[PDB]
């Protein structure tokens, strides 16, 4: 670190023997999946004998 070399954006100090290509890339992927099932069964039998 003799030369106190810095990345051009001024963010980080780097050793004299390396160089940085700035590729400031971000990837986002959000996947949401909702499954809802509802089954309602209702029965009613009624028998009357007189």
């Amino acid at each position: 670190y003799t030369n106190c070399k810095t990345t051009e954006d001024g963010q980080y100090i780097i050793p004299d023997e390396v160089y940085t290509i700035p590729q400031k890339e971000s990837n986002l992927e959000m996947n949401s999946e909702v499954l809802e099932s509802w089954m309602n069964y209702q029965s009613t039998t009624s028998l009357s004998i007189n």
Binding site: E36, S37, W38, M39, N40, Y41, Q42, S43, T44, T45, S46, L47, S48, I49, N50
Partner: protein, 50 residues
């Protein structure tokens, strides 16, 4: 940025209602009186969602 939203909703519903009433009466002249009535109710409901 890309954004996809797919929303599918399915609803199903069935109601079935049967009713039966069977009556029968033999009415003589104050000697024999025989009266019979039967009843039968069948009510069902079935709802499904998705």
């Amino acid at each position: 940025q890309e954004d996809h939203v797919r929303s599918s909703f399915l609803l199903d519903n069935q109601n079935s209602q049967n009713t039966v009433t069977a009556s029968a009466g033999i009415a003589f002249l104050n000697i024999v009186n025989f009266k019979v009535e039967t009843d039968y109710i069948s009510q069902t409901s079935l709802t499904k969602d998705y």
